[PDB]
Amino acid sequence: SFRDCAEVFKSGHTTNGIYTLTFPNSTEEIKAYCDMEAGGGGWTIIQRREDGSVDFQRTWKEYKVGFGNPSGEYWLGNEFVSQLTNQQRYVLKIHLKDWEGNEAYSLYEHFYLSSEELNYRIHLKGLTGTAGKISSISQPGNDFSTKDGDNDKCICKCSQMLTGGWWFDACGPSNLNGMYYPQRQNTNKANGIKWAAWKGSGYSLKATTMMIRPAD
Ligand SMILES: [Ca+2]
C-alpha cells in the first residue's frame, strides 16, 4: 500500500496516471492522479481544473471525501490530505494557466491542513514562484468553507458568493474552486477561478492544478 505518489514513484512506477493510495495506518483507499513525469515526479494531485466540468459547488462532506474523476477535474479530499500532511512535511505547488498561453506557479515549502475539528484550516510557509511574491491565499490561514459550512471571517457567506470550497478570508485573493468561465468571459468575474497575485482579481483562469510532495 502507498500513502502518496512519491511512495509509488520510489517503488518503480515512474509513469503518469491514477494510482490507488491508502490512508495512513488505515485500510481505507483513495484514488489520486500522480504526476511522475515532471519536477522529478512523485507529485500527488489534490485538485485540478482543466475543464471536464465537474461543478465544484459541493457540500462540506464532498470536499471532505473528495469528488470528480482523477483523470480529469477533481478534489482529492480534505480528510485524506489532512492525515497525509500531518504525518510528515509536504510542499504544496500550485500550477496555473491563463487563456493567452501563459503558465506560472506558486510553491510553499510547508503545507498542511488542520483536522476537521478545526475546519481543515490551511497552513502555509516559505513562498517562492512566479505566481506572486505574496501568497494569494490569506496568510494566517483560514478555516475551510463550503456552501453549507461558513467558516470564513466575513459577515457574508464567501462560499455562496464566490462558489466552491476554499479557505476564504473576508473571501480573499483566491479561489481555484470557483465557477469555470470560457475564454472571453474570463474578465471581471468575482465568481471565477482566481489567483490574484498572478492575473489580478477578476481574471478567471483556464486551468489549475494543486499538488503536494514531501522533501524527497
Ligand atoms: Ca461568513
What nine digits make up the cell of 54? 465537474
Q: Cβ neighbours of residue 101 under 8 Å, at least 6 residues apart?
A: none
Domains of the chain and any CATH numbers? 1-131+207-216 (3.90.215.10), 132-206 (4.10.530.10)
Among 63, 136, 134, 67, which residue's Cα sits nearest to residue 96? 136
Distance 92 CA to ligand 1 centre (A): 26
Q: How far is CA 103 from the centre of its chain?
A: 16
Q: Cβ neighbours of residue 16 under 8 Å, at least 6 residues apart?
A: 33, 34, 35, 36, 37
* Euclidean distance between CA atoms 152 and 185, whole angstroms: 27
Distance 7 CA to ligand 1 centre (A): 39
Do the Cβ atoms of 143 and 172 come closer than 8 Å?
no
Positions at the binding site:
150, 152, 154, 156
Tell me how the structure was determined.
Answer: X-ray
Resolution in A: 2.2
Amino acid found at 184: R
CA distances from 119 to 19, 47, 63, 185 (A): 27, 18, 11, 33
What nine digits make up the cell of 118? 478545526
* Euclidean distance between CA atoms 209 and 207, whole angstroms: 7
Distance 172 CA to ligand 1 centre (A): 12
Q: Name residue, grid cell 498561453.
A: 101
CA distances from 145 to 12, 204, 208 (A): 38, 20, 19
* Euclidean distance between CA atoms 132 and 195, whole angstroms: 9
- Widest CA span in the chain: 50
Q: Cβ neighbours of residue 153 under 8 Å, at least 6 residues apart?
A: 142, 169, 170
Could you say which DSSP state residue 10 is in? Answer: T
Q: Name residue, grid cell 492544478.
A: 209
Distance 190 CA to ligand 1 centre (A): 17
Positions at the binding site for Ca(2+):
150, 152, 154, 156
